[PDB]
From a paper:
To enable similar experiments on CymD, we first determined its crystal structure. Despite considerable efforts, we could only obtain one crystal form that diffracted to sufficient resolution for structure determination. Importantly however, the visible parts of the structure show that the S2 bulge and the S3 kink are present and in the same location as in TodX. To allow molecular dynamics simulations, we modelled the missing parts of CymD by using the TodX structure as a template. The lateral openings (delineated by the green surface) are similar in size in the wild-type structures of TodX and CymD and differ only slightly from EcFadL, in that the latter does not have a bulge in S2 like TodX and CymD, but a more pronounced kink in S3. Compared to PpF1-3-cymD, PpF1-3-todX grows slightly slower on toluene and clearly does not grow on p-cymene. This suggests that even closely related MAH channels have different specificities, with CymD being able to transport more bulky substrates, such as p-cymene. Growth on p-cymene vapour is observed only with CymD, and the CymD lateral opening mutants have the same phenotypes with toluene and p-cymene. Interestingly, the equivalent sphincter residues in CymD are Ala3, Val106 and Ile373, suggesting that the passage from the P-pocket to the lateral opening is narrower in TodX compared to CymD. Due to the difficulties in crystallising wild-type CymD and its similarity to TodX, no attempts were made to crystallise CymD lateral opening mutants.
Thus far, only the FadL OM channel family has been shown to mediate transport of hydrophobics. Here we show, by using an integrated approach combining growth assays, X-ray crystallography and molecular dynamics (MD) simulations, that MAH uptake as the first step in biodegradation does occur via lateral diffusion.
Residue numbers in the entry: 3 to 59, 75 to 108, 127 to 364, 373 to 404, 419 to 439
Write the structure that this text describes.
């Protein structure tokens, strides 16, 4: 949903690991089986991700993604709920901002001293702001390929000197602009302590069925002669299905003071079919314009490697490497380096902090994700 630099400052500080490593309450969103690693009691977590991006040769500004968690740990069970947000933008510009708020309902169980199982069911709210410029040639290539339809086509081609159509659907540029939808996702994982120092973990993340995103949009016809004629109406996006993913990984704790974790993850873009329809209906007339953009993606592999050193009773230090690349059934991979630390102000109060620098690819893409969280733990153990 994000970009697996991980979930929370402990995972992100270690390059994205978490299939077998106790990343805290964020395990709800990675491998919920790891929640059995948390101490008994009640855990409240507050944090956010602060993403600033830069692109050499679309807002760079600080994106803020908050995370809330409540986890109960007693005996063999863990129960959790939270709210995990992601924010970011892709690319009269062509752009898409995607907001995903995932609200897990999570549980985990120690089957025995070696085997832990866990699952989450997400309620998922997806929101997209977008702008899409289509010139006269592109409309043509797409009208002859049977990809544009709707009674708005002939009236638009008859705009004098028509140069481009602009689909705008943005909360920030017009009130109620954008589209949104509630949906459902989830994950099912386990951990296995096969060796006293080596734990292995596996989690399958389900395909998120987001369902039809609806809302408001403007379609502006651009003409040097006739001005920019905006038409207002309803917009519907059709077939989204965030892809399933499989994460397998291992944690090795040479001592309580020093651990290393490594994870491998396959994201299954190829099994998301592509019927991605875009329909706009003009609110005065009921005249519509229909549009397909079936864009296929290939599977992605991600490798995550990090380490953690407990220094004294209050300080923990982390570092990690992250490598994402298209999959085996020619592309530049994305690499990221990370570091982080934790401070415990008390047995009940811990601050975690994370910094990750990523790079992709004539295009250069630089991205810094700052991650900070606070956990307040009230213990119980009877």
């Amino acid at each position: 949903a994000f970009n697996l630099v991980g979930v929370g400052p402990v995972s992100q500080g270690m390059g994205g690991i978490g299939a077998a490593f106790n990343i805290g309450a964020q395990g709800m969103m990675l491998n919920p089986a790891t929640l059995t690693q948390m101490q008994e009691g009640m855990h409240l977590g507050l944090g956010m991700d602060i993403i600033t991006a830069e692109l050499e040769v679309r807002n760079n500004g600080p994106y803020v993604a908050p995370e809330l968690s409540l986890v109960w740990r007693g005996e063999r069970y863990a129960l959790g709920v939270g709210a995990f947000a992601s924010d970011g933008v892709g690319t009269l510009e062509n752009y898409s901002r995607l907001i995903v708020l995932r609200i897990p309902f999570s549980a985990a169980y120690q089957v025995n001293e070696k085997l832990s199982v866990g699952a989450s069911l997400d309620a998922v709210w997806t929101s997209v702001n977008l702008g899409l410029l289509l010139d006269t040639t592109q409309i043509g290539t797409l009208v002859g390929q049977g990809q544009v339809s709707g009674s708005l086509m002939p009236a638009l081609l008859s705009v004098p000197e028509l140069s481009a159509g602009y689909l705008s659907a943005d909360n920030h540029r017009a009130s109620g602009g954008g589209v949104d939808s509630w949906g459902i996702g989830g994950r099912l994982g386990l951990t296995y302590q096969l060796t006293p120092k080596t734990r292995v973990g596996i989690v399958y993340n389900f395909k998120t069925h987001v369902g039809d995103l609806s809302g408001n949009a403007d379609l502006t016809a651009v003409s040097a002669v006739a001005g920019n004629i905006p038409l207002s109406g309803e917009l519907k996006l059709h077939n989204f299905e965030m892809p399933a993913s499989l994460v397998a990984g291992i944690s090795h704790e040479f001592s309580d003071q020093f651990a290393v974790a490594f994870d491998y993850k396959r994201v299954y873009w190829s099994d998301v079919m592509d019927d991605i329809e875009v329909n706009f209906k003009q609110k005065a007339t009921g005249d519509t314009i229909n549009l397909k953009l079936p864009f296929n993606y290939r599977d992605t592999n991600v490798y995550s490697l990090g380490a953690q050193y407990r220094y004294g009773a209050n300080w923990v230090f982390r570092a990690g490497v992250h490598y994402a690349q298209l999959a085996n059934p020619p592309s530049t991979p994305t690499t990221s380096l990370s570091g982080g630390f934790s401070y415990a102000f008390s047995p009940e109060d811990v601050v975690d902090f994370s910094l990750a620098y990523g790079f992709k690819k004539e295009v250069s893409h630089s991205q810094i994700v700052t991650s900070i969280s606070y956990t307040k733990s009230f213990h119980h153990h009877h």
